[PDB]
Design a binder for these strands. Structure first.
Lengths: 51, 23, 526
DNA sequence: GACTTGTACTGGAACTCACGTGAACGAATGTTTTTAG
């Protein structure tokens, strides 16, 4: 299978007042898109909004 | 263990789906 | 939407000068052009490609009137690329024994673009030049060149052996060290910079790439790539407020458009092989049942409940399709990236051409950004599409602003798993020396660098800009099989590995901390 | 030594889960050709 570039983001354990685990500790594996996985958006003039 | 589903032991009892509740 | 691309290439003696330890510029330019042609051909793109070589011994250009525009040959005219072009690039194109400037070659390329594109309609015209800038040239025709380029709406791109110890192609490092550049090369670079500034302003500087850099950037197709279609809808914040919007697929995984067809070994035809599916009962006789005598059913815990397709369609959930409604607004901190779902990211802008919708969308985006909020919304592509709940958050840039939409999970889409804690374990607790070793390893393997007194991180390994290697590998293998039917597939190209690997500096710095970690941490397989 | 009965161990297959590949239908939109007013 072709390889994919990924990021391991640390994830610390978090518990609520009930003392029950809600976010397990470990790493979050996030898939990073390649160059060809993106798309080009059409050019659009930027119009600001008044306060 | 507190907050444990009676129907399925080993899985925490998910709260009922409420939806959008404006403050 | 078609396009015309004229590839201008130097084949002079200087291009063949292979400095020891560094690949010659001729080979790098050949590789870049081969990659471009492979992408254009194997993608079945309706793009016209022509090839002009300047520096050849002969002269085969329309401007060869007298002793001007010599040593320039139009190798291929403006016609659809085929395996013939790839074969000519690979084998029957050798460096010339004469040196020619790139200005007459560029004039010849413009003349080809003008003359050939007379009976056809092309939305974009592009010219790419691969040169070393190591030849004498005259500036007498620079102004006319710029005027013609501006009038004819022709884009320009330059590729040079050097960008603006060991050397690796596409290795995320310095291709040509800045020690040995000739004065003529500096003059050519300055002229190219002047031309680019005079054409696209300051933005033209970024369009001067290098062969090694271009091999892992996908820049060659930047000016010919087609825009995605727009999905029009109406963002709804209530029952009387609606904003016309258009959504595009900003990020979507790219797959292979071409499939594989099963063919017979003896004869390479798909019509001699037939695939059929049959249904049989649970009897020793293997009784056959027609498709019309089949009913859909579902399992209900050891009990089979028949459920016909018509009944399912009648009783399936029904909703009004093509809806983009805002369920509510919630603090951005309440939405976490780890919960993102789906396989696409949507970018929502205002309608095609209307100031009112643009103003409304800008107001909403600015309000969300200032208040640190995101919109929980309901998304449905059409009537058939299953409705989904997603999060839309503002995305403001110096040149454009929009709403980025990503799907969110449902209650049953979340898996509740229990994992043992690691911070309160007396058996897996690391020691101070182990923590110091890990810290040293992390410090020695940083892919981001701090710039000089400006507080701007620079990425050393921007994997987001690297093309998917699978497409290049498939194209190279297909071309090798086509041109060499009686040979096995070749190994993976070195530059692919170089671009898929981090800079050698990171490894060199990390050698020591890795050894320290190995010594400190005992690891034994079970 | 040959047969029978009872108990314990164990690797392969069935099941499930998840992903990738390819083919087919319909919705929605856009674009081109042809024909009545």
């Amino acid at each position: 299978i072709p390889p994919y570039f990924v990021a391991l983001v640390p994830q610390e354990e978090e518990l609520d007042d009930q003392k029950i685990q809600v976010t397990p500790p470990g790493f979050q594996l996030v898939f990073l898109p390649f160059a060809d996985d993106k798309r080009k958006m059409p050019f659009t003039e930027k119009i600001m909004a008044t306060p | 263990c507190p907050g444990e589903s009676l129907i399925n032991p080993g899985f925490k009892s998910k709260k009922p789906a409420g939806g959008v509740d404006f403050d | 939407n078609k396009a015309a691309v004229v590839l201008c290439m130097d084949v002079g003696f200087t291009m063949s000068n292979s400095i020891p330890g560094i690949e010659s510029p001729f080979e790098q330019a050949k590789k870049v052009i081969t990659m471009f042609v492979q992408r254009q051909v194997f993608a079945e793109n309706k793009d016209e490609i022509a090839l002009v070589l300047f520096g050849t011994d002969g002269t085969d250009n329309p401007l060869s009137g007298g002793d001007q525009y010599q040593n320039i040959t139009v190798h291929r005219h403006l016609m659809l690329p085929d395996f013939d072009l790839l074969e000519d690039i690979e084998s029957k194109i050798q460096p010339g024994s004469q040196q020619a400037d790139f200005l007459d070659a560029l004039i010849v390329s413009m003349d080809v673009i003008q003359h050939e594109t007379i009976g056809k309609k092309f939305e974009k015209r592009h010219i790419e030049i691969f040169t070393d800038l190591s030849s004498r040239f005259s500036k007498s025709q620079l102004d006319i060149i710029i005027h013609s380029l501006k009038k004819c709406d022709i884009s320009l791109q330059f590729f040079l052996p050097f960008s603006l110890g060991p050397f690796r192609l596409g290795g995320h490092g310095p291709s040509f060290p800045l020690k040995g550049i000739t004065e003529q090369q500096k003059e050519g670079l300055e002229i190219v910079k002047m031309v680019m500034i005079s054409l696209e302003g300051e933005d033209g500087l970024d369009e001067i790439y290098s062969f090694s850099e271009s091999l892992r950037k996908l820049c060659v197709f930047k000016k010919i790539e087609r825009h995605s279609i727009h999905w029009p809808c109406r963002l709804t914040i209530g029952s009387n407020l609606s904003i016309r919007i258009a959504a595009y697929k900003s990020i979507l995984q790219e797959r292979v458009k071409k499939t594989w067809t099963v063919v017979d070994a003896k004869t390479l035809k798909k019509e001699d092989i037939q695939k059929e599916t049959v249904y049989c009962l649970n009897d020793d006789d293997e009784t056959e049942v027609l498709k019309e005598d089949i009913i859909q059913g579902f399992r209900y815990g050891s009990d089979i409940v028949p459920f016909s397709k018509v009944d399912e369609e009648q009783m399936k959930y029904k909703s009004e399709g093509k809806c983009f409604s805002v369920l509510g607004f919630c603090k951005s901190s309440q939405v976490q990236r780890r919960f993102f779902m789906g396989n696409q990211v949507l970018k929502v802008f205002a309608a095609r051409d209307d100031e009112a919708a643009a103003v409304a969308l800008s107001s909403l985006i600015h309000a969300l950004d200032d208040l640190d909020m995101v919109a929980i919304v309901r998304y449905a592509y059409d009537k058939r599409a299953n409705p989904q709940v997603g999060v839309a958050f503002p995305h403001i840039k110096h040149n454009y602003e929009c709403l980025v939409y990503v799907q969110l999970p449902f209650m049953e889409d979340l898996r509740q798993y229990m994992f043992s804690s690691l911070k309160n374990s007396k058996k897996y607790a690391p020691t101070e020396a182990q923590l110091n070793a890990v810290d040293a390893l992390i410090d020695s393997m940083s892919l981001a660098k701090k710039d000089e007194k400006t507080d701007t991180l620079e990425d050393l390994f921007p994997t987001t800009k690297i093309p998917n290697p699978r497409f290049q590998r498939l194209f190279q293998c297909l071309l090798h099989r086509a041109l060499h039917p009686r040979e096995p597939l070749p190994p993976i190209q070195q530059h692919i590995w170089n671009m898929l690997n981090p800079p050698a500096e990171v490894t060199t710095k990390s050698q020591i901390p890795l050894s320290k970690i190995k010594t400190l941490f005992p690891l034994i397989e079970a």
